[PDB]
Design a protein around this ligand. Structure first.
Ligand SMILES: OC[C@H]1O[C@@H](O[C@@H]2[C@@H](O)[C@H](O[C@@H]3[C@@H](O)[C@H](O)O[C@H](CO)[C@H]3O)O[C@H](CO)[C@H]2O)[C@H](O)[C@@H](O)[C@@H]1O
Ligand SMILES: OC[C@H]1O[C@@H](O[C@@H]2[C@@H](O)[C@H](O)O[C@H](CO)[C@H]2O)[C@H](O)[C@@H](O)[C@@H]1O
Ligand SMILES: [Zn+2]
Length: 241
C-alpha cells in the first residue's frame, strides 16, 4: 500500500536511503523538506510544529511543498510544542484556511483518556465547528517481547473508537522512557518488532499511514540506516508491503 513512510533529516545519502527503504512519504518536523531531495514516488508532508510556527509565510510554504498538513508536535510535553488546548484551538482557523487535508496535533500519550489533551482538543473543535480530517499519534513500547504489536494495536483501536477519525502513526519504536535514561531493545528484538508491527498496520483498515522513528542512526539509536546501509531493522522495513 501507500502506508509506509519515515521521519528524516538532511545527510549525505538521505535521497538514496529513502529510495532503498521504499518510503511512499516522509516528513521533517518542518514546513518544507529542509534540504532533502525526495526520490520519485516519495511524498513530502509539511508540519506546523509549534505556536511560533503559525505565520502567513510558513502556511504559504507548507501549501507549496505538499497537499496534507500535520499540526503541532507533542503539545502535551514541556520539551516539545508545550501548548495549552485553548492556544491550539485559537490558532486552528489559520491552519484550516489553507484548505489542505489537516491532521490533529500529535499527543505524546493519553489519546484515549477522558479529560486528556486530545479529548479536550477534539471536543473543543467540535463545539467551534472546526474541521479535523485525521488524528496522528506517537507510541513507544517499553515491553520488548512479541506482545508489543498487540499493545500498539489496542492504543490505535481505542483512539479510533473514541473519535472515529482515520489514524496516522507519525512516530513509533520500542523505547522505555520511564527510567532516568532511555532503554532500548536488542537488534534482534527491534527487527522482529518491525516485521510484526508493519504486517499488523498494513492490515488495519482505519490506519492510513505510519512512520518508524526514525530513518537514520544519526537521529536516534532506533535508526533503520547508517549512511546508505540498512541494519537488520532497515532490512525488515524495506521488506514490508
Ligand atoms: O517553526 C518554528 C519552531 O521551530 C522549531 O524547530 C523545529 C524542531 O523543534 C524540530 O525538532 C524535532 C523534535 O521535535 C523531535 O522530537 O525530534 C526530532 C529529531 O531529533 C527533531 O528534529 O526539528 C525541526 C526541523 O529541524 C525544527 O524546525 C523550534 O524548536 C521552535 O522553537 C520554533 O518556534
Ligand atoms: O521528548 C521525548 C520523547 O518522548 C515521547 O513520548 C514519551 C511517552 O512515550 C511516554 O509514555 O511518556 C513520556 C513522558 O514522560 C514521553 O516522553 C514523545 O512522543 C517523543 O516525540 C519525544 O521525542
Ligand atoms: Zn481563547
Amino acid at each position: 500500500g501507500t502506508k509506509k513512510g519515515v521521519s528524516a533529516a538532511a545527510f549525505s545519502g538521505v535521497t538514496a536511503a529513502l529510495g532503498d527503504v521504499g518510503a511512499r512519504w516522509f516528513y521533517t518536523w518542518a514546513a518544507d523538506p529542509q534540504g532533502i531531495t525526495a526520490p520519485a514516488g516519495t511524498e513530502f508532508v509539511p508540519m506546523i510544529w509549534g505556536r511560533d510556527s503559525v505565520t502567513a509565510d510558513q502556511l504559504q510554504r507548507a501549501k507549496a511543498a505538499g497537499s496534507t498538513l500535520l499540526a503541532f508536535n507533542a503539545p502535551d510535553l514541556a520539551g516539545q510544542a508545550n501548548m495549552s488546548v485553548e492556544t491550539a484551538l485559537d490558532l486552528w482557523p489559520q491552519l484550516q484556511a489553507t484548505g489542505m487535508r489537516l491532521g490533529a496535533p500529535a499527543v505524546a500519550y493519553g489519546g484515549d483518556t477522558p479529560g486528556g489533551w486530545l479529548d479536550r482538543f477534539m471536543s473543543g473543535a467540535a463545539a467551534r465547528g472546526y474541521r479535523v480530517d485525521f488524528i496522528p499519534l506517537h507510541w513507544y513500547g517499553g515491553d520488548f517481547s512479541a506482545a508489543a504489536t498487540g499493545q500498539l494495536q489496542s492504543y490505535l483501536q481505542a483512539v479510533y473508537n473514541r473519535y472515529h477519525r482515520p489514524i496516522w502513526l507519525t512516530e513509533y519504536a520500542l523505547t522505555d522512557f520511564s527510567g532516568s535514561t532511555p532503554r532500548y531493545p536488542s537488534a534482534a528484538e527491534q527487527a522482529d518488532f518491525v516485521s510484526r508491527s508493519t504486517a499488523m498496520l498494513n492490515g488495519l483498515s482505519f490506519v492510513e499511514r505510519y512512520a518508524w522513528f526514525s530513518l537514520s542512526t544519526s537521529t536516534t539509536p532506533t535508526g533503520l540506516y547508517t549512511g546508505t546501509t540498512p541494519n537488520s531493522s532497515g532490512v525488515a522495513y524495506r521488506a514490508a508491503g
